């Protein structure tokens, strides 16, 4: 929580996701703009990598395809296109890298829509 996490996260993005306190401040600022669901969408996607098993890989795969692609609330991650078909075709016999295309597209939305304002958001200048 020192000006290092602040000066460090402003020079590179990895340091922001490769640390517990980073994923935290980002989880809060986003909550304001009502853009936190995408946050979990990243952990749930990068969580399936600590498995790559086979039996649990299927149950969990549904939680992701169910909690979003199916239906649940207006908080549906902004996504739906050529990828909606690739996920439905790859859904059979999934793997620890099926959302690699979806999880990527989103990580880009936060980097492009949240980084320009986060670098100047009070949540980050509030500790500066």
Curated annotation (Swiss-Prot):
Keyword Metal-binding: no
Annotated RGS domain residues: 12-128
Membrane topology classification: Lipid-anchor
Residue numbers carrying Phosphoserine: 19, 73
Domain of life, source organism: Eukaryota
Keywords tagged on the record: Autophagy, Lipoprotein, Membrane, Palmitate, Phosphoprotein, Signal transduction inhibitor
GO BP annotation list: autophagy; G protein-coupled receptor signaling pathway; negative regulation of signal transduction; small GTPase-mediated signal transduction
Subcellular location: Membrane
Main location as per UniProt: membrane
Cellular component, GO annotation: Golgi apparatus; membrane; plasma membrane
Tissue specificity note: Highest expression in lung. Placenta, liver and heart also express high levels of GAIP.
Changes after translation: Fatty acylated. Heavily palmitoylated in the cysteine string motif. Phosphorylated, mainly on serine residues.
Keyword Transferase among record annotations: no
Residue ranges that the Swiss-Prot or TrEMBL entry lists as coiled coil: none
GO MF: GTPase activity
Quaternary state and interactors: Interacts with GIPC PDZ domain. Interacts with GNAO1.
Function recorded in the entry: Inhibits signal transduction by increasing the GTPase activity of G protein alpha subunits thereby driving them into their inactive GDP-bound form. Binds to G-alpha subfamily 1 members, with the order G(i)a3 > G(i)a1 > G(o)a >> G(z)a/G(i)a2. Activity on G(z)-alpha is inhibited by phosphorylation and palmitoylation of the G-protein.
Protein name as it appears in the record: Regulator of G-protein signaling 19
Originating organism: Homo sapiens
Lineage of the organism: Eukaryota, Metazoa, Chordata, Craniata, Vertebrata
Segment of the intact protein contained: 80 to 206 of 217
